[PDB]
Each structure stands twice: as structure tokens, then as C-alpha cells.
Amino acid sequence: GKYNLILSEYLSFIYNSVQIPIYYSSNSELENRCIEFHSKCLENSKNGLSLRKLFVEYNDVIENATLLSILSYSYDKYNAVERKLVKYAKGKPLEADLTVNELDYENNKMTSELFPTAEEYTDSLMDPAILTSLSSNLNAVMFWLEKHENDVAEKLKVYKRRLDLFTIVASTINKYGVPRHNAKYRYEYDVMKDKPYYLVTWANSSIEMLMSVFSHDDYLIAKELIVLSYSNRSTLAKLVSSPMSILVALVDINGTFITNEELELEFSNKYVRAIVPDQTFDELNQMLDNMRKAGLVDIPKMIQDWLVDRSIEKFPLMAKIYSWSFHVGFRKQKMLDAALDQEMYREYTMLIRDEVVKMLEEPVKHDDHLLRDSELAGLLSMSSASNGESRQLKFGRKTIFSTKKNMHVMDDMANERYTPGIIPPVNVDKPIPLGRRDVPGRRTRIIFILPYEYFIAQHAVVEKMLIYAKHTREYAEFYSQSNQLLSYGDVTRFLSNNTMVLYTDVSQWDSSQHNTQPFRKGIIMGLDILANMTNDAKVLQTLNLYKQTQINLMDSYVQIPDGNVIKKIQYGAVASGEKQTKAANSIANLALIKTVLSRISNKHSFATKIIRVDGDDNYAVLQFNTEVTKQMIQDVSNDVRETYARMNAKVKALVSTVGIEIAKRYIAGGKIFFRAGINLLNNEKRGQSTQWDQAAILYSNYIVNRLRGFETDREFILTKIMQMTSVAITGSLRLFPSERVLTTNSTFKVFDSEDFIIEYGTTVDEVYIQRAFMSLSSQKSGIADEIAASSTFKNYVTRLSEQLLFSKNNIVSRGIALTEKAKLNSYAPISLEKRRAQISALLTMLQKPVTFKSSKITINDILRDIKPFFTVSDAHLPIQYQKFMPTLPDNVQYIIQCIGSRTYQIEDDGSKSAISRLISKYSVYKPSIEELYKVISLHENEIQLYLISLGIPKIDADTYVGSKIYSRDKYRILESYVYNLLSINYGCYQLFDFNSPDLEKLIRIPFKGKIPAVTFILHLYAKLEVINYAIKNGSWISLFCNYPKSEMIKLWKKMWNITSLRSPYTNANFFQE
RNA sequence: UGUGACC
Ligand SMILES: Nc1nc2c(ncn2[C@@H]2O[C@H](COP(=O)(O)OP(=O)(O)OP(=O)(O)O)[C@@H](O)[C@H]2O)c(=O)[nH]1
């Protein structure tokens, strides 16, 4: 409940020259008392009278009613920031050392010196691209500095470490003034011409870093990074994190977790000696020297101190630095420079070709329907992203322009222009438009925005490849329902004194031109073999068109902007934008390592315990018939790099016996770590989400970092959410939503009142509001209706339906209509009509919560029903599992030490239900978990129709609608649907073993019937309540259930009429991965 | 309609 209090201290801090608390109640009488109170407050304020008396008079409203929002009548002129900042600007400003960066524009020169004229200006190289101002970030940091002004002991030492760092930011800013943003949170030329180009973005990164400072070590790290980053905008992060790839090979393993035959973590008390050849030490020194040469002093010393003993117990500091390096910001270069960097492959191509065959051999031989109707599959999978060119489009009676793929496909069909039989060229005549990928620390990479003929031609085939990977272990990122803990356990498994692990970053090879030939060629060579495996006209064409995308790309040309011009240059490298990007890259990276290992075997004899490809890295674990020595490592290592060298691949290749470090994860001293470097106050690019959506994403980002090891003060995050979620009524009237409004599980939820704990309404007022917010969840869009009525549109839907099903549609047809009406959301005009409506609705809602005919059931109600039938009692769970993920907070780690962890994802889509598999054997359709949910609950006769309507043959449609399997699917679907509504795969929960024997102990559930659905939810509701109590209290409880039998039948019914909820919080989770 | 692929 502390959010609602912190909110006022904030407004009372920002504004000084009124606040009007607005309450509400599910109880009639009390509500009028709220209504009255509101009035009297406005009136008294409109007379400069003290509200102190009303607060006493309506003491009842302050005590029993629920705080809905807070009115903020502030009369100034968005200044204050200017004023407030001086106090902290006493230090000497920083002076950009314009000699640190290669490309001239990467140096913090004065904006003007980079863009002499307003027409040459572009924020494209510094745009924070976030819907929150620098002005407000500042305000937020001072608000906090004030609140913790009179702190003591250690808390003060945190303030003191921060007070300093913030001076640097303040001093340096004051020297130029505070950059003012516009309605779109953009920094324009007039305001930027004076100040250093990178002023704003650097401010954002520095503030975000200083606010995540606690220990003296944080302070030392923030300080350095904040100072060097004001001048270095291109190698800092790579410099500060490069060492980490060597450090993991130093720490000794004294007990670690491994993967067993049941694919689950299991403790192994073993010892593995870290064996490091001297040469490695030179490499690490050159890296430490390089850091030094760039100004770095403190950070290098820290790694140097740690290097005396190299204890996994003091390693935490090394990982802290590794995660901090990223908070410097994104390296945003110019499209041109980004694109500018770009006989013994016989073995390498042969592998790509064979691997491509293995994945489609069966599918092709058996005339897989997916492959036959590949084109139709491509259409249903189509997104609403860019096609490349902004086309003029006529809908109904409106001529509008769009670049959207979903739009171009419709318009093109309605004019005989739709022709997926012909795969457009991407050469000099039709140059590929470009997109960009920005990341912190690494160089910018370009992206192909190919025409839709390319997606359709690849979609089906790629999906068959991803399936082969799903059950192939070499493909770490696609195998089973596995999470990262499984990959962690696979490495540590064979680690012993007679084996060495070999990790390798191959990100530079994928972009190499030396690669583009063996690649495309290898695939094409495979597609040919596959074609000689069938005679199916459908299969050969879908397979042929795929061959065409590879040939058109062999010699592609690109449209690289160079100011305000678009130069067309011949691109001879494999960029990414295809449907096969990830799959193909995985196939390639794997073929590569297989080639290297095979070559080096001619010298040394080893055993291949495991080979793995995961993203832009690949690794292996080798076993020798003798004990490994520092000299054996050196020899293997040299021969490996040498092998990679003869292939002209600039890659990082290290060899150790204890750890590995790759982009997604790194294993030091038998433990697992995940870089905690998601930026907070700077984004890669601008999307179309709202501020509210961004508030939730910030919090979501806060959570993941926090779990990963980088914690940013929760009071700062909360402050940011107050700013971003506010809504202006006028110029002097700003509305701030209450904790109840922002944390309740509704369509407007932004974060959990308590970290790692998702609450659900357990009071009438909470329920009251919960139902209200839903009343206005989806808003209308005139523009969207118009186009949803246009011929070109209805014909598209209709044409898609007539190709898919045979008998009648409706359930499915109503789906295809909407799925298409939604894709029109990427189209800004529609996106804007929506928001505007949401704001007005939300404006009148936080002013007098409307009514609602409810009649809709949500997971909240189900739980609110159950709650009353459980008896709690103090219990005890000893800690038994050793920590394998060191950075986890303490309250989250405790849970795992008691109940354990898991290495899988709980099926939450229903893809494992027989019906879903049935519909897959005969249809290209893909029903969602929510559609399966409604379908499976229909009358037997109706299900039989749905199946046959989608192409499922009667013998099968009938053999199912009765069988034991059907009755089963019913349970498994609901089970999958519920795990989905509870976010059992996100946040903290994704870590916990919900089937832990230890946890099951604390749940006592006497069966008073035997009706699966009810038994399921009662157990889950208990497991969640028990875990939440532990997350918040550090102790355990036992839950006893005495749920009536007469009640179980009522519940069972509610269960099948649950409604899913959509919200920023919900969408934030999906946005994660 | 300051917008920029696969997922
Ligand atoms: N910062 C600030 N703004 C005020 C104050 N009083 C009124 N405002 C209004 O808030 C605006 C301040 O500039 P903005 O950039 O829009 O700041 P904001 O809209 O309040 O919040 P952000 O967009 O996150 O910065 C002005 O347009 C004023 O109309 C005040 O005391 N401080």
C-alpha cells in the first residue's frame, strides 16, 4: 500500500504553490460519502481553504473507501526542473574527449558541428526512443535524493555514493541547460544544436546507473562508466565485458548441478580442476591493458584483485561488472558504416545440405499436407509489418497509404496482382530496403525488409525445420520445452579432469561474405535432393519457390540511406529478415562446429560428449584418453583457431575445463549466470505501444534485471510509473492513478503491488473495480470499421476461409475475421484512434467508476470462490538444495533452496492435446489455447462438425469425439489454459518446481468426489498461496482443504466459462520473449 | 500514418 503514500510525497515535492484525493466504494452509502467529499474538496480548493477539516469530517471515506486516483492542480509552467537542478550542479562539468571514437559522429561533439543545418539534423543516432522525458528522469532522481537526505548508517552511505554521481550528471547538464522534449518525447534541432549531441541519451544511461547503486563497488563502477561513456560511445561495453570470456575458464568447480536421464537438475559434489595455459593469461592481460589504455582504472584493478585467488565466492563482482557494462546505452551507428564492415567449404556445405535434408525428408516423402498447402499456411501466418514500400491503397471509398504487409496482400489480390508464384528480384533493379538492429556493446547490424512473396515461400518449410529441431538436442534453443537450466546442466554433466569444453562466438562469421556462398548453396543443394524424393505438384512448387529465394539472395543489392539520399550498393553478405534466419543460422553454426571438430581430430583423439548450437554461439565437450594438461589445452586451442582461420572466419574461440560464456548465458565455477543488461531509460527503437504499455515494460525490465543481478531502486521505478501513467485533463490539471488501479489484475494492470507476487481480488471493492475496467477494455476505431467493411477486405477473409475449410465455418470464420481486423492495429491511424478513446474512457473512469452488468467470469472469481475453504497453519521446510543461480534475490532463492527448481516450461498452449495434434495432421489451421478451450467444451455433435469442417476425415472425427482421449483432452486443455492465465511461465514462477515433493507435503487435499478440474485448481491455488507466503515471509505454511462436494459441481461449471484478460502487465510479459 | 524484417 506504500505506493499511494510515495505518490503524494512526490507531487508535494514537484508542485508547491494542491492535491485532491478521489475515493470510491462498492457500497452505496459509502460511495455518496466519497462523492460528497470530492465535491467539498474541489470547492474548498477553489477558495484557498484548508482541507484539513474535510479529511476529519470524512474520516470514514479515508479509512474504509478505496483510493482511486489523485488530482494534481499545479500552477507553474513545467519549469522547476531548471531551478531544482542548480543545487546539485556544483562539480566541474565533464569535457568530452573528442579523440576516443573512430567514426567522427560517435564523439560527443556539439550537435551543430555534426549537423550544421536544421535540415541535416537527425536524432537517429541518440534518440532514447522512449515515452518518458529526460526532464522527468531528473525530477525523479532529485525527489529521491531529498527523501533520503537525512538517512543514517549504511542507508546514508548509499545516498552519499549517489549524491556524488548525480553531481556529475547535474554539473555537466547545467553547463548547457536541460534539453526540452516535444509532444512525442523527441529532441529536435533547435534544442539540441547548442548541447552535445549525446547529452540526453548519456544522461539517461547515467541516471539509470547511479539509481542502481548501493554498495561501494556499485559506486566505483557507476562512476567510471558514467565518466568514460560521456566520451566513449563505441567500445566501452565491449572493453568492460571482454575479459569475462576468460574468467569463466579460471574458477574451479567445487560441486555443481547436472542434468540426469529424466532431464532435470541434480546435485553433483564433484571437483573439476580449472586448467589454464599461460598464453591465455597474456590474452587476458592484453584485455586488461586495453581497458587501461582507454581510461579505465578502478574496474581493471577489481578484476586484477580477483585474479589472485579466483574464488567462485568473490566472482560475484566480476559478474556485476559484466552486467553493468551494458547500461552505457545502445551503439547506434549510421546505416552505411553498419553495412560497410561486410575450396575448403566442401565439407561445410555438404553438412548444411544433409542437415536440410534430414529435416524435410519424412515430411516430403509422405506428401505432408503442410508442404502441399504451404502457400495457404503462409497467408494465415502473415503479420502486419513492413513490406518495404509505402503503397497507395484504396479501401471501399478511401485512398490511404500504408507499408503494411497485410494491406499489400489484400489490395494485390483484389487486382489480380497477387502472384506468389513469382518471387520478386532483390538485385540492382529491385534493391532491398533496410532495417536495423541496435544492441548495447555490439556494432549495429542491418536487416532486409523483403517483400511478402519471401515469407510465404519460406514459412511452411521453416516450420518443418523448427519441428525437427524441437526434438534434436544439438539445437539448445529449440529442443523440447526446455529452459536455460537444462543447457546449463548439459555442459557441467561431463566435466571431469579428462575433458575440456570448447566455446565459440561465431557472430562475425554469419555476417561474413566468405559465408554467403557455402550457405545459400548448401541449402539449395539440399532442396534439390528433397525435390527428387516426390512427384507431388504441390510439394515441388512450395519446395521450388524456396529454392528461388535462395537464388535471388545470392546476389542482392541494398538501399542504404546516406543522409537524405538512398545509395544502392551490392550487398554480398547474409543479412537477416528471412523466415529461415534463426533456423538456417542454427543449421549453419552447427555445420561449422562439426567441420572444425572433424578437422582437428586428425591430430588429437577425443570423444564428443556433446555438441551444441545456441544463437550466435556453438560449443562442445571433448573427452581424452588421458588427463588434460595446460599444454594439451593450448594445442587444442591453437589448432581450433587455426582451423577457423583457414576458413577466413573472424571468431572468438576459447578452451577450458570448467566454464563457458555465450551471449545468452555463462557458467562460472559450476554456477549459472545471466547478464543483467536490459536498459531502462533508453530503448532500441520506437514502436507503437502507449506510455502505460511502456510503464509496464520498464517494470518488467526491472524485474528481469533484479532476478539477473542488477537491481535498480524500486522507489525510482515506482516514481517513473507515476509519471508515465498520469493523464492531463488540461494544462494545470494532471490525473495520477492509484495503487489499486495500477496493480489489480485488470486490463489496466501495470505491476504487482509486491515484487514476485501476483495478487487477485479478495475484497468487494477490488472486485468492483476489476469488473468496471473490463467494461471498457476494447475501444472502437472508425477507420478500422471502414476498412473492415471494404470489399477488398471481406473478399480476403472469405477467400482465406474457402481455401481452408470444407463444410461450414462460423467458429473458425469468426476467428479469421477478427485476427485480420486486429492486424490493422500496426497501422498508426487506427492505433491512434484507439488510444484517444482509451484515454477519454479511462478519464471518466478514474473520476466516478461506472457500473457493469458483469456476467463475465475471470480467473479472479474462480480463485475468490476457493479461498474461503482453506485452513492455514505454520509449517516448516528445511533448505536442501544448493544455490546454482547466485544472483537471484534472497526471497526468491529461498523458495528454490526449499522446494527445488525445474528445467522445463509448463505447456500453456494446448499443443499437446490429441485434438490439436489431430487438427494438425489434416489442417494447416492453428487454433489458440482459447479456441481449443471453447471447442473442447462444446456438445459432442458440434465437435465432430468442427473437425470435419476443417478437413478431418470421419473415421477419425468420429473415433475421437467419443474415445477416452477426448474426455482427457478436456482436462489437459483446461489445465493448459489455466496455467496460461496464471503466468506460471513468467517472472519468478517459471523457476519454481510446482511438482516438488517438498511442496506437495504442505498441501493437504482430501478428495470429496473425484472431478479432475476441481482437484486441479484447488492444488494449484494452494501451491501458489503457499509459495507466495514464503516469498513474502521467508517461512512456510500448510494448507488444508475442506471444499464441499455440492460446491465442486458449481465450481466445475464456472471453470469452463473463464475469460482471459488483456493488459500492459500481460503484454509486457509476452514482450519479454 | 516521423516506423524500420523474423521471432
Ligand atoms: N515539470 C513540470 N511541469 C508542469 C508543472 N506545472 C505544470 N506543468 C505542465 O507540464 C509540462 C512540463 O513539461 P513536459 O515535458 O510536458 O513534462 P510532463 O508532461 O509533465 O511529463 P514528461 O512528458 O514526462 O516530461 C508543461 O507543459 C506544463 O503544462 C510543473 O510544476 N513542473
Side-chain angles (χ1 to χ4, degrees), chain A residues 432-691:
Chain A
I432 304 172
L434 257 49
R436 57 186 311 153
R437 175 57 177 170
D438 296 296
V439 60
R442 194 177 288 289
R443 141 193 293 284
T444 288
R445 285 157 301 181
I446 59 160
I447 287 165
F448 290 169
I449 295 181
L450 306 162
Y452 70 59
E453 283 80 14
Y454 280 88
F455 179 49
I456 301 177
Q458 289 197 173
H459 175 62
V461 174
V462 168
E463 277 315 312
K464 287 306 182 182
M465 297 200 277
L466 291 184
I467 280 157
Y468 180 91
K470 189 104 177 61
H471 68 68
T472 302
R473 298 194 76 189
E474 278 63 32
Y475 293 89
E477 154 171 39
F478 308 119
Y479 186 72
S480 190
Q481 298 170 71
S482 86
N483 63 2
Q484 297 222 63
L485 306 181
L486 184 79
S487 299
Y488 155 54
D490 282 1
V491 189
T492 61
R493 173 64 223 290
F494 305 111
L495 301 190
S496 52
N497 63 189
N498 72 335
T499 67
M500 50 179 91
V501 54
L502 186 185
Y503 48 129
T504 304
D505 173 355
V506 287
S507 50
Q508 298 298 298
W509 163 253
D510 306 307
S511 64
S512 154
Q513 297 162 294
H514 280 295
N515 168 53
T516 182
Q517 233 52 289
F519 185 68
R520 308 293 186 189
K521 287 183 177 183
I523 296 175
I524 299 175
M525 287 184 71
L527 297 175
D528 294 322
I529 295 176
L530 297 181
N532 276 307
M533 297 196 136
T534 185
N535 328 306
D536 208 302
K538 294 287 192 173
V539 176
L540 282 179
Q541 179 60 162
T542 163
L543 196 176
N544 187 67
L545 289 174
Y546 199 84
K547 177 177 187 175
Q548 187 67 198
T549 50
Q550 290 321 88
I551 286 168
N552 288 35
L553 293 167
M554 293 264 242
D555 184 76
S556 53
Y557 275 70
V558 153
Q559 309 179 210
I560 301 176
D562 197 349
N564 300 309
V565 179
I566 297 172
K567 301 183 174 180
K568 310 188 184 297
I569 93 89
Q570 177 190 57
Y571 204 69
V574 181
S576 88
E578 294 168 76
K579 171 76 187 190
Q580 53 147 46
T581 294
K582 287 182 192 174
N585 248 59
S586 295
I587 297 173
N589 295 310
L590 172 48
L592 185 53
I593 180 182
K594 284 186 179 178
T595 300
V596 171
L597 284 177
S598 179
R599 172 66 81 184
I600 69 173
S601 71
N602 306 177
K603 264 191 166 183
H604 333 59
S605 267
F606 60 80
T608 304
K609 306 307 296 176
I610 79 177
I611 295 191
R612 293 277 182 294
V613 53
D614 184 76
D616 272 19
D617 280 279
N618 57 51
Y619 52 87
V621 173
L622 311 196
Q623 191 170 67
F624 294 92
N625 270 64
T626 170
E627 192 170 315
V628 169
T629 54
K630 296 159 72 76
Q631 178 67 194
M632 293 190 87
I633 280 187
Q634 165 187 306
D635 288 287
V636 183
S637 154
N638 290 160
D639 292 60
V640 167
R641 303 192 192 177
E642 165 54 35
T643 297
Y644 271 122
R646 184 63 201 96
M647 296 192 96
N648 280 63
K650 291 301 156 289
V651 302
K652 90 162 191 185
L654 294 162
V655 166
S656 108
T657 53
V658 307
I660 73 161
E661 188 251 330
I662 67 181
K664 305 186 198 301
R665 71 197 90 114
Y666 62 101
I667 306 170
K671 302 305 175 188
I672 181 94
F673 297 80
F674 298 107
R675 153 167 265 135
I678 290 161
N679 270 256
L680 262 45
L681 302 166
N682 285 298
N683 277 158
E684 158 181 43
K685 52 200 152 215
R686 288 174 176 266
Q688 63 309 299
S689 72
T690 75
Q691 290 178 63

Side-chain angles (χ1 to χ4, degrees), chain A residues 715-727:
Chain A
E715 289 184 47
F716 177 60
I717 302 293
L718 282 195
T719 304
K720 291 307 296 183
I721 298 175
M722 283 161 251
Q723 301 170 322
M724 314 190 61
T725 63
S726 76
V727 176

Side-chain angles (χ1 to χ4, degrees), chain A residues 14-15 74 76-81 133 136 139 181 185 731 734:
Chain A
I14 289 291
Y15 319 101
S74 52
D76 240 19
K77 287 167 172 53
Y78 66 76
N79 280 284
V81 187
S133 78
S136 67
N139 268 155
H181 51 94
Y185 294 98
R734 195 173 278 284

Side-chain angles (χ1 to χ4, degrees), chain A residues 870-873 1002-1005 1021-1023 1025-1026 1037-1041:
Chain A
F870 268 108
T871 60
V872 184
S873 90
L1002 313 180
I1003 316 291
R1004 318 125 94 191
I1005 287 187
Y1021 175 87
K1023 291 175 181 173
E1025 275 280 280
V1026 167
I1037 59 176
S1038 173
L1039 239 53
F1040 176 69
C1041 185

Side-chain angles (χ1 to χ4, degrees), chain A residues 364-426:
Chain A
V364 171
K365 290 180 181 293
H366 303 186
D367 288 336
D368 195 295
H369 76 306
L370 180 48
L371 287 179
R372 310 177 88 278
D373 307 299
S374 65
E375 190 195 310
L376 174 48
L379 287 168
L380 292 157
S381 298
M382 194 72 60
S383 55
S384 48
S386 184
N387 200 40
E389 57 195 69
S390 176
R391 296 183 180 179
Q392 311 316 310
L393 301 181
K394 294 130 291 72
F395 285 108
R397 178 177 44 187
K398 268 298 186 56
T399 303
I400 238 58
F401 66 86
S402 167
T403 336
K404 309 316 188 179
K405 224 172 301 188
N406 69 310
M407 309 267 247
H408 293 195
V409 185
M410 297 188 316
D411 193 60
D412 294 341
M413 291 199 320
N415 292 37
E416 223 68 46
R417 285 193 49 173
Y418 174 74
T419 60
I422 314 170
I423 294 166
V426 295

